Design a protein around this ligand. Structure first.
Ligand SMILES: [O][B]1([O])O[C][C]C2=[C][C]=[C][C]=C21
Ligand SMILES: [Zn+2]
Length: 258
């Protein structure tokens, strides 16, 4: 009886095994655009992905992770609200059964079709496992997906999904360039939060881009053909793998833009 997103093991259950589910800095949150304060002291964000080394794509039973070589400072996030250097370790998505839901963060209560998370760890803590035990251990760049025009830079991801349909399947995924998933503008909101999946550790600086990327109906339809289940098991489509908005509590969402 493991956690997931079903009727019986979904987000409203998670607090029984992971009591920090009801903690003081949980994610995701609703971003109230009228209440977020422009912080003129925030630096521009530095996304340095030109030497990124992608390795592999894994269906882990909840999402799929595109994993990177994080054994050196190849793909890093710096600046904005961050002190020091954060190494890219993986990216994944959360998405819906239909285009009107899927994102984890919301914007004035608006749900996007999906949400990309580029996960980075603070190199002062030496490894990811140590970083997630620190309040400043991770920085997650969040990017909304809306359905409209195809995203060309996403199609190599879409075309490998058939090969990792079920939980535990992986495929080689070298030479993928994550710059192809970014919007034009790096304008962002930032707040202190958590992992949105168990163990729901309170170790994340959230940086959520204002500008969504466009993906095609066909691209997101291929996400929705993935399975939560293992090979040979009854099919459970991998949809609605999103945690809803959590109470903001004693937190301020800051804007990088006026
Ligand atoms: O959804 B989640 O918070 O977003 C990126 C950070 C991370 C890392 C491992 C598993 C899940 C997540
Ligand atoms: Zn995520």
């Amino acid at each position: 009886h493991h956690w997931g997103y079903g009727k019986h093991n979904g987000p409203e259950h998670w607090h029984k095994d992971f009591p920090i589910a009801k903690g003081e800095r949980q994610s995701p949150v609703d971003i109230d655009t009228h209440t977020a304060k422009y912080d003129p002291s925030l630096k521009p964000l530095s996304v340095s992905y030109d030497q990124a080394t992608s390795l592999r794509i894994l269906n882990n039973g909840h999402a799929f992770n595109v994993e990177f070589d994080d054994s050196q400072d190849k793909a890093v996030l710096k600046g904005g609200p961050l002190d020091g250097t954060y190494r890219l370790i993986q990216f994944h998505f959360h998405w819906g059964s239909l285009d009107g839901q899927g994102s984890e963060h919301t914007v004035d209560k608006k749900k996007y079709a999906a949400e990309l998370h580029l996960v980075h760890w603070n190199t002062k803590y030496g490894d990811f496992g140590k970083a997630v035990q620190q309040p400043d251990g991770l920085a997650v760049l969040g990017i909304f997906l809306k359905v409209g025009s195809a995203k060309p830079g996403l199609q190599k991801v879409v075309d490998v999904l058939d090969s990792i349909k079920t939980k535990g399947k992986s495929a080689d995924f070298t030479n993928f360039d994550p710059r192809g998933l970014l919007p034009e503008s790096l304008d962002y909101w930032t707040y202190p939060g958590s992992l949105t999946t168990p163990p729901l550790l309170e170790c994340v600086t959230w940086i959520v881009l204002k500008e969504p990327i466009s993906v095609s109906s066909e691209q997101v339809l291929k996400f929705r053909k993935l399975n939560f289940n293992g090979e040979g098991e009854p099919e459970e489509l991998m949809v609605d793998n999103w945690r809803p908005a959590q109470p903001l509590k004693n937190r301020q969402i800051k804007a990088s833009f006026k």
